[PDB]
Design a protein around this nucleic acid. Structure first.
Length: 88
DNA sequence: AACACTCGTCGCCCAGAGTTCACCTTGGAGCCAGGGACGGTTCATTTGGGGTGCCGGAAACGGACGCGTACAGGCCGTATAATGGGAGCTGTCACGGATGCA
């Protein structure tokens, strides 16, 4: 319990409430189970059927789950300049 | 090759084209005199009309005001036993100097 609560409260650059992290992890887990079972990836409507909630909220959860990237990671094929040198 | 006729060309002579030179009339062009009616002006009405400020009040209307409901985020607890990480890939060289050992 302590480890999972701390993961939810501290693992992400943008804090996500545990009530939303739980649904994100559950969605990912059962979606990978569905992919393994069915042989293809599950579509958002199919995943919403298991979430017992609407595909709009499924998509909102999906776009919420994304994490930021570093402004200083090298973007070029070689190491020449940082991503921060491309942002207006 | 010898012989006896009819036609432009010019001058001249008389009459008017039409033009000038040069004479009488009479409709003037206008100048003024006189008399409207007239249209521009002004001033009396004239009450037909615009006007209005406010309200009884009727009804919309804008909002306050109190009290219900709604997911979002947070806290909390799950009692067989479960008792020391994977993974990292590392071809540089120069080389000054500290540095842990000499």
């Amino acid at each position: 319990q302590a480890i999972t609560r701390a993961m939810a409260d501290q693992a992400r650059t943008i804090r996500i409430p545990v009530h939303m992290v739980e649904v994100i992890n559950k969605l990912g887990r059962i979606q990978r189970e569905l992919l393994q079972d069915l042989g293809r990836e599950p579509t958002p409507e199919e995943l919403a059927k298991e979430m017992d909630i609407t595909p709009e909220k499924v998509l909102e959860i999906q776009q919420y789950a994304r994490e930021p990237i570093s402004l200083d990671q090298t973007i070029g094929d070689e190491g020449d300049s940082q991503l921060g040198d491309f942002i207006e």
